[PDB]
Symmetry: C3
Subunit: 120 residues, 3 copies
């Protein structure tokens, strides 16, 4: 029905965070968002990464979560976000009591918007 739609769209969209809100934190250096690059692939294949992001493959997050700080709010991203890799990671983080979102648009969006990207 019309209610179930709004309810599903509200929760679903809640799993994401606007890339603008992440860009504002990044510039203002207010540091309240930590960006996790959760795609599975060697640095040789990725060669890219959002400015200040922390490499942490999705298939290892459930085993390396102890490196993260609970008080921080995490923002995870994959190659395109059109896969289930972002949500997979998110479920782990949300269950461990963390507060995390999937970056709307993912890496593709971010590079397409010409936003800060580094090589390292």
């Amino acid at each position: 029905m019309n209610d179930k739609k709004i309810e599903l769209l509200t929760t679903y969209l809640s799993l994401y965070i606007d890339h603008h809100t992440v860009l504002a934190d990044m510039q203002n250096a207010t540091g309240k968002y930590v960006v996790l690059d959760v795609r599975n692939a060697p640095a040789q294949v990725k060669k890219d990464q959002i400015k200040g992001a922390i490499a942490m493959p999705a298939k290892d997050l459930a085993t390396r979560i102890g490196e993260l700080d609970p008080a921080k709010t995490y923002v995870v991203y994959d190659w395109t976000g059109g896969t289930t890799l972002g949500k997979t990671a998110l479920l782990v983080l949300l269950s461990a009591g963390f507060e995390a979102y999937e970056l709307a648009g993912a890496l593709e969006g971010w590079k397409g918007m010409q936003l800060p990207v580094e090589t390292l």
Copy 2:
């Protein structure tokens, strides 16, 4: 269990509309649907669109919604159904009372079927 999977799939699928139903609208010219290209990327990168679509990014659809017909049914689309643009636009529309759906297959699936695309 499956009762949960079935409930999600039913609501989720109700957010979309088959491209076979939208095409049949413009070929028979019944003015039943209005196609909205909610892509945020600039006109340059887009280069083309769906024959008859009204370009209107998901980021502005919230304000430019004053130029839409409350009685008409709207169908939003993007490059690929792998982003929250369609769903965000749907939250905006379905909330203002409008009735809308996401174009199943986005522009990518519409081109793959060699369907009519107007350059602009």
Copy 3:
């Protein structure tokens, strides 16, 4: 919103099945998964499919319901992870009592990994 999102992510992810699981089952001839290509596009359009897959159009799934064995585990796949035919089928299948899962990554991600994909004619 916490539990709601954990509920959604859990149920949503239970729809799919890892591709490492589907491949490791066809390369080991374990055959515990029956892959179904539920694309509605004609053969002339989709001149390729996952190796050893049954062409079960999502639009003819109910019409040919008797051709499915309620004992086998079905794995459906679409064009890309954005299309909705995979989930449309999953609905008919799950409701009819069948055990089904949607291939994570769809054909697009299956081809982009150099995985086995024969061509029909």
